[PDB]
Amino acid sequence: AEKRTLIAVIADEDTTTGLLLAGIGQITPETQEKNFFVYQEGKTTKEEITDKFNHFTEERDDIAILLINQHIAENIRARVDSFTNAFPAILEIPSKDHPYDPEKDSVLKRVRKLF
Amino acid sequence: VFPTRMTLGLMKTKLKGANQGYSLLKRKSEALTKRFRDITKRIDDAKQKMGRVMQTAAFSLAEVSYATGENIGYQVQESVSTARFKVRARQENVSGVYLSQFESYIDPEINDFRLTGLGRGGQQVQRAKEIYSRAVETLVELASLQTAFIILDEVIKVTNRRVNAIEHVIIPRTENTIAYINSELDELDREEFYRLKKVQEKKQNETAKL
Amino acid sequence: EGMTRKDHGDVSNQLYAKYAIGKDAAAMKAVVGEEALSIEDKLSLEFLEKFEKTFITQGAYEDRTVFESLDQAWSLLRIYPKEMLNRISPKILDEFY
Amino acid sequence: EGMTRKDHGDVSNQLYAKYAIGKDAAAMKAVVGEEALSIEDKLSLEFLEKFEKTFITQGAYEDRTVFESLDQAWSLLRIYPKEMLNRISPKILDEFY
Amino acid sequence: VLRDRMKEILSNAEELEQVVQLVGKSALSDSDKITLDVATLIKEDFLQQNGYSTYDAFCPIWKTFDMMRAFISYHDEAQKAVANGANWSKLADSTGDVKHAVSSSKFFEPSRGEKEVHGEFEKLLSTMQERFAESTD
Amino acid sequence: VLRDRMKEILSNAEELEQVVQLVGKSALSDSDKITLDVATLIKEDFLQQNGYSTYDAFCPIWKTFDMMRAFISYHDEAQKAVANGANWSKLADSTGDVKHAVSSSKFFEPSRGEKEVHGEFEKLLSTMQERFAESTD
Amino acid sequence: VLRDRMKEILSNAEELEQVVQLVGKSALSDSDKITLDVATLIKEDFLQQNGYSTYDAFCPIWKTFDMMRAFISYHDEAQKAVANGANWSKLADSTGDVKHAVSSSKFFEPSRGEKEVHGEFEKLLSTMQERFAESTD
């Protein structure tokens, strides 16, 4: 159970900034590696998001819940779908100025088939 | 090949083991999918609800970032070195299976970060954090069901395979094996009686003629 | 009547069906646990233990006349509401729960 | 004990119980999945193979000392805690293990 | 009285074992776990004995009764203890000292109390009662 | 060496095949996934000797040896390649054409190369070795 | 014609019930739901009897004929209308009086139209047609 109490973020810069101010993530004091990843839309390559994905899910283990923007999650669709674990939780929420889509939501796809 | 002489007794109990498993496991399966459905409708709504809240808090924060004439987010990244909103984990029995549940705590031993006092620009950040702490709490409390959901999704798939397997394979194997052995078995008892009767007939003939 | 009652037939249907369901409930309880079980299954469980331990169980020198038996039956069945009792005519069900 | 040891009868008794569980755990392993496994059983699955392929196996020309046989028994048993043992009196065990 | 309870512990264990084999354990009631545990004790002390019990040359009725009496008392206190609230695990950990003591019963021979009634088992009942007190609160 | 390796490939295949049918192939690892696949090829190619040729019906002692050797070299190389980092699906895809060629080998006459020991089987050894380097990395 | 179509509706339904169990009702269309209803009627009207009236006690060839004619007639129009822009829920609320009437035919006399050809059915064809105009529109 308890061995994890950070919420990590893959989101647009404003959303992330806000979330941190509110206090969820951190820049660790003995790894000196962020436990959040900011994204400049369209200006950041799809390959850099993927490294960061691996980082929160696997290369870190203190991540409880992994938050991820629908716009961003779609770009790296392959890696998200392949992640099916509950440790950390994958919870896709709408991106900033983007509406809900059931098909940018990895878990909802999974659930629908084989009900 | 399986033992011919009185396997019947063991093989009957195999059937009773199998049988008990179909009913019980089907009850268990039935109950998990009944729950699963309930969660489905909750999770679907909760995604839409989080999205609205996250976009509104994000836009108020964005407006402020632009008005002050400096990017607040850089200031914010140095100061973040703790997290106010954390989770504490619990395992909860939802049916026989343990699912992950989370209950959120806000550290009251954690002060406000210093990103205020910037002048007129500082007022703007000060109002901004207050809407956002409220908003962020939403995302986490709703998120507790998701982790339980994903697990629930994996376990039901395994429990579903097991019912199908016992029903199709296991039970008919117990029927066919039982039957094969029965057919040989009854014949050993019957032929004996015929053997006895044939020898006795010869005997009766000899004895009668005296 | 006169060595039975009219209400004898309807009751025979309620108790058999509820009992069967009680056995099924015992197996489910072991699996799900006590703190994760259904209401309907919980009732069926309660019935199993009382049914066994009161109706079937009687002492060596205790005579159970048919009139006596039928009363003990209504106490057991009472735990279910009227909503879950239905293989019984509402006439009876209103007389004796 | 004069041409064997006193533990010869105890050390044999332990190895049957563990081998028996390992064999049932194997059958269950196929049908349901790894869902019915428990800590003791996983250990028992390994024990089965370990025993089969080291203990029982030997060359045609090979012959074996009884005292030797007994150290190889102990060795296989060394992968289980002592609290899980019970077909050996705690006195006997303490001396040879 | 002891006969009925002896029967009940053995009886429920066989049915719960069948659910254990097929479904597995991921859950098994607080009460159900207790029954299994205590039934192991009965196997080990009674059912197993033939050159494994250092006293077995003749065993009196009183001694048998006294031994079983400790097992049954441990059972009722334990099931009550989970229901009035106290975790199953806290309950195993606190019973501790006495639980071993009943596990070890089988080697013990009449040498205390009477010539057929044994003091170690009589002592045991009262200490059990004290364990329940620690365990519920 | 080939007699011991032949028994071993079939024997492992049998145990795993029960686990796949009832439980799923989800429990199994990629090396054991391979075990089923190499073994399947041996079923279709060896056992089937009805043919429509006298080359698919007569397999000399030498023709039988080359075939078995080629197939084991595959299995050993295959368990390693997935072990130092490759998939059952990925491995299957890379050999691909080279796998068909070993299946269809049996149809080919034995009277070529040295005697029944063809150059067709000898070159095939090198192509497996090469494939191994690709598969792993 | 009527009889082959009757066998098929009961067969197809069984399969559609299995889906209700596993997935539920969130993967079934208006047309599949309609199959279920027709099947329930066939079963109700024919299979269930108990001597409710002196019309269950004896039934002629004609009454048997009129019952199934009514069920197929509804089946084709109803499925057609959901294809053309209607809902099972819609079909249900409007059908109301005509649909209860066909279910209850078994209590009533068959002697309504003539003397053994049933009038409760003959009028139904006209009402079901009229029903379908309203349903599509």
From TrEMBL, chains E, F, G:
Top-rank lineage group of the source organism: Eukaryota
Limits of the ATP synthase A/B type C-terminal domain: 1-90
Subcellular location: Vacuole membrane
Sequence positions that bind ADP 2: 49
Record family assignment: Belongs to the ATPase alpha/beta chains family.
Subunit annotation: V-ATPase is a heteromultimeric enzyme composed of a peripheral catalytic V1 complex (components A to H) attached to an integral membrane V0 proton pore complex (components: a, c, c', c'', d, e, f and VOA1).
Protein name: V-type proton ATPase catalytic subunit A
Species per Swiss-Prot/TrEMBL record: Saccharomyces cerevisiae (strain RM11-1a)
